[PDB]
Design a binder for this molecule. Structure first.
Ligand code: NAP
Ligand code: 1DN
Length: 157
């Protein structure tokens, strides 16, 4: 299976200055649970933003940099390389990767951040005419998670 994982706000903002615009621990937990034991494919900028490979999953980084060789990370240099990766593959970001892969993925696990943030990077537009809502679950709010959010699982019709 080839899936997208993304958190985007009401206007599809996904990032600002190479970081998440919001602090939402529950989104990170959501992503951890979905991807543990599986594969993440991310662009070079997203990788450098996180700063280290995430434990207990395969970390694959897409970059044109032939000097890229980081411990605990596998490197690919083409979009086509993604299709040769076994198991459940998750497209992990960022904007460029999402734009390249939205037409290619089986499904999407979206965290809709129910707010309007300042962004410099965006998830591409999509329509529910193309995507079936497999599930929609309202995120629980507490002291550490104060922004309303909804976990959507969308499957291409
Ligand atoms: N909200 C979310 O779910 C989420 C998740 C992840 C990231 N983000 C955000 O997204 C933003 C980053 O997005 P971005 O588009 O600027 O960067 P990005 O997608 O993370 O990485 C872009 C880089 O990936 C490499 N790349 C992409 N396609 C390639 C291809 N076909 N062949 C070879 N290399 C390729 C290139 O690396 P080289 O220049 O090294 O060649 C390119 O510069 C940040 O703000 C981050 O916080 C948000
Ligand atoms: C150390 O723990 C984490 C740190 C993280 N930093 C990030 C950053 N995102 C953008 C810039 S940095 N995340 C990420 C990375 C990708 C995500 C995606 N595709 N989708 C969703 N929903 N959340 C993400 C969180 C992270 C996810 C993490 O745990 C899973």
């Amino acid at each position: 299976t080839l899936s997208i994982l993304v958190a985007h706000d009401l206007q599809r903002v996904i990032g600002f200055e190479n970081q998440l615009p919001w602090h939402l621990p529950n989104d990170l937990k959501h992503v951890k649970k979905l991807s543990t034991g599986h594969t993440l494919v991310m662009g070079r900028k997203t990788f450098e933003s996180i700063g280290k490979p995430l434990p207990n999953r395969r970390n694959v980084v897409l970059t044109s940099d032939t000097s890229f060789n980081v411990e605990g990370v596998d490197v690919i240099h083409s979009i086509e390389d993604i299709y040769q990766l076994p198991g459940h593959v998750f497209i992990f970001g960022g904007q460029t990767l999402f734009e390249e892969m939205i037409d290619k993925v089986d499904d999407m696990y979206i965290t809709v951040i129910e707010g309007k943030f300042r962004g410099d990077t965006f998830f591409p537009p999509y329509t529910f005419e193309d995507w079936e809502v497999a599930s929609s679950v309202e995120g629980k709010l507490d002291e550490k998670n104060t922004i309303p959010h909804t976990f959507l699982h969308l499957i291409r019709k």
